[PDB]
PDB file of C-alpha atoms in Angstrom:
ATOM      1  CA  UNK A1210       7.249   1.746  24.367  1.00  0.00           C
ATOM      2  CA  UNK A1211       7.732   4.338  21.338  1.00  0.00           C
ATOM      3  CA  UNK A1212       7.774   1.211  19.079  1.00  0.00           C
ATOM      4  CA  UNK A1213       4.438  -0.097  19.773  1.00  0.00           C
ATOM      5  CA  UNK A1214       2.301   3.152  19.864  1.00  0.00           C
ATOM      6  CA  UNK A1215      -0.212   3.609  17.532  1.00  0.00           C
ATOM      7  CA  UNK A1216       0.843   6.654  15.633  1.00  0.00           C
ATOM      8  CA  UNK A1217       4.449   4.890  14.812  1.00  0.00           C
ATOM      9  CA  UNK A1218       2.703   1.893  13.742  1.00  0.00           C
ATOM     10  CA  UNK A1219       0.150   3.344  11.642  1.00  0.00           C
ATOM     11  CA  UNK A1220       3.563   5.588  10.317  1.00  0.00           C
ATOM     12  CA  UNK A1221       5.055   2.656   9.332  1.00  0.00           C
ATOM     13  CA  UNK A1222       1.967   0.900   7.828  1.00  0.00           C
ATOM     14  CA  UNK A1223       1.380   3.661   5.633  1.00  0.00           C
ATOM     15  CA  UNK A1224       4.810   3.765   4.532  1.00  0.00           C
ATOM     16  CA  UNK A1225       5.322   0.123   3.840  1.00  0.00           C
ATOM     17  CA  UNK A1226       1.886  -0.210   1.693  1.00  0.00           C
ATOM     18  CA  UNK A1227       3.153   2.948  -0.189  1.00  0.00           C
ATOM     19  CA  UNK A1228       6.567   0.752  -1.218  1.00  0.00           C
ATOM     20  CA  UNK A1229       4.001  -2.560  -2.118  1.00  0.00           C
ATOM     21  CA  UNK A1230       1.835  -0.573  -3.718  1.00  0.00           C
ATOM     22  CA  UNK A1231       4.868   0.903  -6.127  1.00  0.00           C
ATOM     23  CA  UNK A1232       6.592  -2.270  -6.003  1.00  0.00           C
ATOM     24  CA  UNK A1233       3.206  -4.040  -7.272  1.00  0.00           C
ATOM     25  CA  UNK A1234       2.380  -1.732  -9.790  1.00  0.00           C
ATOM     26  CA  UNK A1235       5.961  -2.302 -11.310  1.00  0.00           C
ATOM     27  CA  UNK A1236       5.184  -6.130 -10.934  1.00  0.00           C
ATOM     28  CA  UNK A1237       2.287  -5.348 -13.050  1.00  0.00           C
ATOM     29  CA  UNK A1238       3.805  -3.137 -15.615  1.00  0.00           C
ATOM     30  CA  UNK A1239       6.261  -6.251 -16.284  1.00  0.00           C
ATOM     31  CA  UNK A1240       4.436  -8.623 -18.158  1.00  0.00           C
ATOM     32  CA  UNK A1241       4.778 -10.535 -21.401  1.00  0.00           C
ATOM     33  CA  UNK A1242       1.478 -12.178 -22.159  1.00  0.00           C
TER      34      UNK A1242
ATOM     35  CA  UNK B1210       0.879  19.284   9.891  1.00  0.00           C
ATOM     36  CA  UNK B1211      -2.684  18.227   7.870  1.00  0.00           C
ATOM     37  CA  UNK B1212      -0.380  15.279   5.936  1.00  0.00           C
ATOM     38  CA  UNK B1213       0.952  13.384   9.258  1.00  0.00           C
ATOM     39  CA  UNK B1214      -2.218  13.150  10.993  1.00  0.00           C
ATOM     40  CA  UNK B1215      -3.345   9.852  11.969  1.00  0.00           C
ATOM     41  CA  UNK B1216      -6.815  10.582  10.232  1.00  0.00           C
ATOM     42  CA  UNK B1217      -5.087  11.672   6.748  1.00  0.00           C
ATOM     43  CA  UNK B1218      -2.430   8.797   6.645  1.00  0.00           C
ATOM     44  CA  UNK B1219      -5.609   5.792   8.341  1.00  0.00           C
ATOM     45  CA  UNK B1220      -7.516   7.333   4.819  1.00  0.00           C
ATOM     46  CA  UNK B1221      -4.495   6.785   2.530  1.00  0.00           C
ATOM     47  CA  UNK B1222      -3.564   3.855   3.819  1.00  0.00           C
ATOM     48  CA  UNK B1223      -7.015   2.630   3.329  1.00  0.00           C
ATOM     49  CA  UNK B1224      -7.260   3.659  -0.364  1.00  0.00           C
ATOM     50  CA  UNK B1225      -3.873   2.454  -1.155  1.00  0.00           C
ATOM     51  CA  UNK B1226      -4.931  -0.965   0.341  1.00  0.00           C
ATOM     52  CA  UNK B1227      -8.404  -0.626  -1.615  1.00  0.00           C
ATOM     53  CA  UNK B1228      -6.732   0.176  -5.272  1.00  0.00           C
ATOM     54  CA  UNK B1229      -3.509  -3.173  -4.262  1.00  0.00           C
ATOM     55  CA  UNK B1230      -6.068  -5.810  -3.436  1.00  0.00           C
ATOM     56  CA  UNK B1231      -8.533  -4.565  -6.583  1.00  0.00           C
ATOM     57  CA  UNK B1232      -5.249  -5.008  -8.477  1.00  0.00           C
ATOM     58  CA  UNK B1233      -3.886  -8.646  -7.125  1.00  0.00           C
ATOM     59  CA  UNK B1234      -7.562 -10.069  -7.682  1.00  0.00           C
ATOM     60  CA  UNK B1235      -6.832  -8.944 -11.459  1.00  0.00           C
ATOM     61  CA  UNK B1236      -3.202 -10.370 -11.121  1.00  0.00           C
ATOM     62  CA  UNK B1237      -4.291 -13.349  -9.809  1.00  0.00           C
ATOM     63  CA  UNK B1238      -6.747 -14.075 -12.530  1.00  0.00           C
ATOM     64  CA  UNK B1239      -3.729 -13.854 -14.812  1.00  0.00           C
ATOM     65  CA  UNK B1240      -3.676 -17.766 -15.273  1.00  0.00           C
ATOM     66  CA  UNK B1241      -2.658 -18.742 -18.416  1.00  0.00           C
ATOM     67  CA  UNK B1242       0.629 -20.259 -17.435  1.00  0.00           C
TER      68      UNK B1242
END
């Protein structure tokens, strides 16, 4: 029940999109063309 | 207190999402290869 609240998942939303974000602006960074 | 509010970290969130898919539309064009 503390899993599937809506602060915990909004928590964990906004943490993983701040990793992809990071992660796809390093993606981006890398590039040879 | 302000930063972990679910109105603060919905607007981030919603930014950050904003600013990643502006970014993969660009990445996507990348096409060359």
């Amino acid at each position: 029940r503390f899993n599937s609240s809506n602060d915990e998942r909004i928590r964990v939303t906004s943490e993983r999109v701040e990793n992809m974000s990071m992660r796809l602006e390093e993606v981006n960074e890398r590039e040879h063309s």
